[PDB]
């Protein structure tokens, strides 16, 4: 079974966020969100792969195909892998061009997930952007229009603070 995601992105100023975090937390159901610190890579043989380490969970990698409605969808197959993956993909022949760590908070929902973070460039962490980014990644096998429609309602609820659209 293979699933394709429904995600679409937007960014939020620093002063804005203080209202956004309270807005998102109350709007959706959750308890005491968690700060997620992960160190992501990108691998090219063309078959662009993303392997993420989080500061004791295992290295989770994910592939996103080419995009295929009010949503952006590309075939995705995400597979959890144990440690020592990076050297494994070196022996594969894959080459790493850049790697960036992401910092922020994520809030959940019934199916959809919201994660607010800022991209850090590595040389040694530097803020690539002054404003965070938020997406509404939804994972669902055999994607149908019904799942995407539900996101439209939720996005409209979040429209005032940040207006987000797929790109």
């Amino acid at each position: 079974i293979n699933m394709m995601e429904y995600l679409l992105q937007g960014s939020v100023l620093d002063h804005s966020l203080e209202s956004l975090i309270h807005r998102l937390r109350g709007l959706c159901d959750n308890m005491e969100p968690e700060t997620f610190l992960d160190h992501e890579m990108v691998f090219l043989l063309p078959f662009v792969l993303r392997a993420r380490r989080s500061m004791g969970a295992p290295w989770h990698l994910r592939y996103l195909g080419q995009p295929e409605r009010h949503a952006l969808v590309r075939n995705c197959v995400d597979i959890a892998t144990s440690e020592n993956l990076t050297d494994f993909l070196m022996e594969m022949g894959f080459r790493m061009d850049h790697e960036f760590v992401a910092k922020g908070h994520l809030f959940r929902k019934g199916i959809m997930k919201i994660m607010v973070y800022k991209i850090f460039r590595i040389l040694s962490t530097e803020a690539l952007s002054l404003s965070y980014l938020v997406e509404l990644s939804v994972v669902a096998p055999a994607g149908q229009d019904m799942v995407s429609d539900d996101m439209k309602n939720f996005a409209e609820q979040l429209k005032p603070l940040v207006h987000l659209e797929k790109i």
Partner: peptide
């Protein structure tokens, strides 16, 4: 009517999908 910079979104989004920086 601050609280969201569209250009920061577009410049940033171009980074995550393809390496901008």
């Amino acid at each position: 009517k601050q609280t969201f910079n569209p250009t920061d979104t577009n410049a940033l989004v171009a980074a995550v999908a393809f390496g901008k920086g």
